[PDB]
């Protein structure tokens, strides 16, 4: 449902020439208590990586 | 160069800290301190 909370993390910083950081989303919690471990890449609004 | 030779040898001298006496300081307790074995409580009777 909408309003589910997703939790992610990043690490390693950026190198030179990079303007995007790789975010991995780990878990999501439905407003009714459902919990599913999606370990998925986080992208931008149009699916571009990081 | 003699100047570079002096600098290279005597350049790395760590600083020294001078804190005076009577200064105020803190101690930030890093663990749970338990005083159960050395104190106990009792009520003082009225009047």
């Amino acid at each position: 449902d909408r309003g589910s909370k997703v939790v992610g993390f990043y690490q390693g910083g950026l190198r030179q020439g990079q303007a995007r950081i790789f975010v991995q989303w780990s878990r999501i919690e439905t407003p009714s208590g459902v919990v599913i471990n999606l370990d998925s890449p986080g992208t931008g609004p149009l699916g571009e990586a990081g | 160069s003699a100047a570079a030779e002096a600098l290279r040898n005597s350049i790395n001298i760590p600083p020294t800290l001078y804190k005076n006496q009577g200064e105020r300081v803190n101690i930030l307790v890093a663990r749970d301190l338990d005083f159960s074995d050395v104190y106990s409580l009792e009520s003082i009777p009225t009047k």
Binding site: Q11, G12, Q24 | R31, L33, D34, D37, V38
Partner: peptide, 26 residues
């Protein structure tokens, strides 16, 4: 005489707890 998951390498390494054991007064 005489008888006889394995990820999050950097972040999850920074989140390792520091557990300091308590003390008891004497």
């Amino acid at each position: 005489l005489t008888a006889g998951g394995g990820g999050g390498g950097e972040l999850a390494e920074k989140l390792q707890p520091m557990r300091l054991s308590g003390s008891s007064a004497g």
